[PDB]
Design an enzyme around this catalytic site. Structure first.
Site, mmCIF file in Angstrom:
data_model
loop_
_atom_site.group_PDB
_atom_site.id
_atom_site.type_symbol
_atom_site.label_atom_id
_atom_site.label_comp_id
_atom_site.label_asym_id
_atom_site.label_seq_id
_atom_site.Cartn_x
_atom_site.Cartn_y
_atom_site.Cartn_z
ATOM 1 N N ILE A 1 5.677 -47.687 -88.597
ATOM 2 C CA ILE A 1 5.556 -46.749 -87.431
ATOM 3 C C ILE A 1 6.969 -45.786 -87.464
ATOM 4 O O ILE A 1 6.658 -44.870 -86.671
ATOM 5 C CB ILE A 1 5.681 -47.657 -86.083
ATOM 6 N N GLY A 2 7.769 -46.004 -88.166
ATOM 7 C CA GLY A 2 8.950 -45.268 -88.102
ATOM 8 C C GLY A 2 10.356 -45.764 -88.241
ATOM 9 O O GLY A 2 10.331 -47.170 -88.176
ATOM 10 N N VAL B 1 13.992 -50.307 -89.328
ATOM 11 C CA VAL B 1 12.644 -49.796 -89.371
ATOM 12 C C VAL B 1 11.679 -50.465 -88.499
ATOM 13 O O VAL B 1 11.781 -51.821 -88.137
ATOM 14 C CB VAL B 1 12.119 -49.980 -90.852
ATOM 15 N N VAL B 2 10.566 -49.938 -88.058
ATOM 16 C CA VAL B 2 9.528 -50.667 -87.104
ATOM 17 C C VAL B 2 8.143 -50.409 -87.889
ATOM 18 O O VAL B 2 7.692 -49.468 -88.272
ATOM 19 C CB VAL B 2 9.553 -49.638 -85.721
ATOM 20 N N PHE C 1 3.400 -54.325 -78.611
ATOM 21 C CA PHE C 1 2.720 -53.119 -79.220
ATOM 22 C C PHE C 1 1.854 -52.136 -78.355
ATOM 23 O O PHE C 1 1.104 -52.614 -77.751
ATOM 24 C CB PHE C 1 2.035 -53.393 -80.696
ATOM 25 N N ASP D 1 20.410 -44.357 -75.341
ATOM 26 C CA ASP D 1 19.725 -43.519 -76.361
ATOM 27 C C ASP D 1 18.170 -43.379 -75.991
ATOM 28 O O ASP D 1 17.380 -43.539 -76.664
ATOM 29 C CB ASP D 1 19.733 -44.319 -77.696
ATOM 30 N N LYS E 1 14.868 -41.135 -75.202
ATOM 31 C CA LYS E 1 14.304 -39.979 -75.683
ATOM 32 C C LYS E 1 12.763 -40.133 -76.033
ATOM 33 O O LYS E 1 12.214 -41.333 -75.909
ATOM 34 C CB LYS E 1 14.975 -39.688 -77.288
HETATM 35 C C1 LIG Z 1 4.835 -41.371 -84.072
HETATM 36 N N1 LIG Z 1 3.434 -41.956 -83.982
HETATM 37 S S1 LIG Z 1 2.380 -42.679 -82.948
HETATM 38 O O1 LIG Z 1 2.584 -41.805 -81.685
HETATM 39 O O2 LIG Z 1 1.235 -42.888 -83.389
HETATM 40 C C2 LIG Z 1 3.454 -44.045 -82.491
HETATM 41 C C3 LIG Z 1 2.367 -45.380 -82.321
HETATM 42 C C4 LIG Z 1 3.221 -46.753 -81.954
HETATM 43 C C5 LIG Z 1 4.636 -46.736 -81.628
HETATM 44 N N2 LIG Z 1 5.037 -48.147 -81.163
HETATM 45 C C6 LIG Z 1 6.451 -48.414 -81.473
HETATM 46 C C7 LIG Z 1 7.133 -49.527 -80.854
HETATM 47 C C8 LIG Z 1 6.248 -50.555 -79.987
HETATM 48 O O3 LIG Z 1 4.882 -50.509 -79.764
HETATM 49 N N3 LIG Z 1 7.075 -51.474 -79.565
HETATM 50 C C9 LIG Z 1 8.186 -51.147 -79.810
HETATM 51 C C10 LIG Z 1 9.545 -51.926 -79.802
HETATM 52 C C11 LIG Z 1 10.611 -51.215 -80.255
HETATM 53 C C12 LIG Z 1 10.891 -50.151 -80.975
HETATM 54 C C13 LIG Z 1 9.413 -49.416 -81.250
HETATM 55 C C14 LIG Z 1 8.342 -50.010 -80.686
HETATM 56 C C15 LIG Z 1 5.256 -45.430 -81.680
HETATM 57 C C16 LIG Z 1 4.813 -44.272 -82.236
#
Ligand SMILES: CNS(=O)(=O)c1ccc(N/C=C2\C(=O)Nc3ccccc32)cc1
Length: 281
Positions: free
Chosen positions: A10-11, A17-18, A75, A120, A122
């Site tokens: 996811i990033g 990393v997630v 999620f 942090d 954003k």
């Molecule tokens: C950038 N693409 S997107 O919009 O499809 C997308 C899709 C899913 C997420 N979810 C991230 C996260 C999530 O669900 N629970 C978390 C707890 C801590 C840090 C990140 C997360 C973030 C971005």
């Protein structure tokens, strides 16, 4: 963990990393965060599990195996950044902007009351669902342990090492302005550039507007002197109630900057509702 099937990245984050993953022992879909182990960190993380609120991404489990740390969170399918991009042509309707802001402040008020800072905030850390809710993610992970400086409070950029809950209100204010105008408020590409873009809009701070500012570690008497601009120019479509609240979220002096609790009672939210957005997943 062999107990999770990684679906996709996811990033990357400030602490790891997630991945979107499925719990093979429950079939649940979760957000797996592989952290990149100090005892204090373990205890600091342990407290975050007790932090339950509808506008905070829930930390489900902490797995400390083979001297490695993985955090399991609930999620959500989209972050605010992707939503703003998808709405770039039309913009986010004001009723929804108001709803999201109101919910985020409830989230912050709750965290702040427990003395948990973000530090942090954003768009990428704000998650939304099809229900019209929005949640804070990666909360309180900063203390336990190119990056964007666009949402950093001035006291941080000036060397204050003991920042407060007020730094989150500042970041929220920047995000607020970005949703309204559809463009980053202070898009700096370095610490000094970030500071100067802030000074060029809100005016270079002095002892009058911010007592003690000239005693900050990284303050320099040689900073250029810029005059403050009018908010009607900075966030145009925003009405007087909105501009009034934004200005209180962007006060230089952390002690005069509005708290999440006080912001919730501001007139801007008198007509708040909970619209459901049209999301494309
Ligand atoms: C950038 N693409 S997107 O919009 O499809 C997308 C899709 C899913 C997420 N979810 C991230 C996260 C999530 O669900 N629970 C978390 C707890 C801590 C840090 C990140 C997360 C973030 C971005």
């Amino acid at each position: 963990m062999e107990n999770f099937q990684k679906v996709e990245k996811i990033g990357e984050g400030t602490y790891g990393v997630v991945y979107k993953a499925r719990n093979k022992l429950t079939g649940e879909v979760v957000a797996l965060k592989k952290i990149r182990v100090p005892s204090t960190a373990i205890r600091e993380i342990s407290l975050l599990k007790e932090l339950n609120h509808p506008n905070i991404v829930k930390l489900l489990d902490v797995i400390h195996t083979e001297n490695k740390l993985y955090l399991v969170f609930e999620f959500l399918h989209q972050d605010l950044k992707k939503f703003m991009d998808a709405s770039a042509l039309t913009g986010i309707p004001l009723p929804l902007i108001k709803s999201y802001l109101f919910q985020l402040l409830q989230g912050l008020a709750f965290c702040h009351s427990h003395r948990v800072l973000h530090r942090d905030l954003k768009p990428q850390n704000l998650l939304i669902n099809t229900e019209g809710a929005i949640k804070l993610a990666d909360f309180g992970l900063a203390r336990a342990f190119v990056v964007t400086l666009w949402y950093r409070a001035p006291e941080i950029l000036l060397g204050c090492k003991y920042y407060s809950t007020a730094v989150d209100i500042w970041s929220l204010g920047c995000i607020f302005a970005e949703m309204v105008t559809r463009r980053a408020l202070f898009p700096g590409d370095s610490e000094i550039d970030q500071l100067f873009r802030i000074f060029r809009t809100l005016g270079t701070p002095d002892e009058v507007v911010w007592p003690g500012v000239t005693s900050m570690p990284d303050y320099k008497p040689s900073f250029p002197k810029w005059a403050r601009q009018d908010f009607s120019k900075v966030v145009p479509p925003l009405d007087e109630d909105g501009r009034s609240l934004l200005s209180q979220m962007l006060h230089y002096d952390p002690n005069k900057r509005i708290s999440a609790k006080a912001a919730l009672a501001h007139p801007f939210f008198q007509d708040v509702t909970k619209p459901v957005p049209h999301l494309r997943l």
